[PDB]
Design a protein around this ligand. Structure first.
Ligand SMILES: O=C(O)c1ccc2c(=O)c3c(Cl)cccc3oc2c1
Ligand SMILES: O=C(O)c1ccc2c(=O)c3c(Cl)cccc3oc2c1
Ligand SMILES: [Ca+2]
Ligand SMILES: [Ca+2]
Lengths: 115, 115
């Protein structure tokens, strides 16, 4: 599991459960090709998106469907989605966690990259 | 101007100066059409992107070129850019400040919307 996504809710103080997440990889023609997707679990985590063999160097986009999340909770949101765009670089063994903390008019994201 | 962008640097505790910002608007064919662009000043602020006439309803994407910013400071950062995607003016004109706070492996963004 080289890529995991974790989503937290800053309003309710909880994991963000059942959030749709789509991962795309940038193609040679600069378009975004679907790569993996899923919904966060009760812990706010989305595991099993990809494998070591599939996850090659490149530019990836993680789109978190925050608008649908807030709407399911009855809360008025600002963003259409949260988008995290990054380069995967093979500098020895690495596992990537893309984490996001959501509020209705703000989000924060960090990368936790470990060996 | 109804759209302002402000960027801060969380490593230095300073405005993020000379950050390139590109704004796109979703077209009727669902592609991202260029809308406006500029760069942050010595205060970290970007004024004058657009006008009340040009800033119509739509879905907008504000791309903040964080990688180019860090690279100019001699730092290899994680993200390619920070992306802020939102529907604007759906209930009439508003003024939007899109703020971002940058670190090499993380960013936060918030919107301040006023009438
Ligand atoms: O990976 C985890 O377990 C984990 C735990 C805590 C956080 C967290 O508090 C956090 C904050 Cl403030 C801002 C932006 C992203 C974040 O991501 C996290 C991720
Ligand atoms: O518009 C301003 O003047 C302004 C002032 C402070 C902040 C700020 O601290 C801040 C933080 Cl912590 C996290 C994410 C976005 C932010 O945007 C700001 C914007
Ligand atoms: Ca490389
Ligand atoms: Ca409308």
């Amino acid at each position: 599991c080289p890529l995991m996504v974790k989503v937290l809710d800053a309003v309710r103080g909880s994991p963000a459960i059942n959030v749709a997440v789509h991962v795309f990889r940038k193609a040679a023609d600069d378009t975004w090709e679907p790569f993996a997707s899923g919904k966060t679990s009760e812990s706010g985590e989305l595991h099993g998106l990809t494998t070591e063999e599939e996850f090659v160097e490149g530019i990836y986009k993680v789109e978190i469907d925050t608008k649908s999340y807030w709407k399911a909770l009855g809360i008025s949101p600002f963003h259409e989605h949260a988008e995290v765009v990054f380069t995967a670089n093979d500098s020895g063994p690495r596992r990537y966690t893309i984490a996001a903390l959501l509020s209705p008019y703000s989000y924060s994201t960090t990368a936790v990259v470990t060996n």
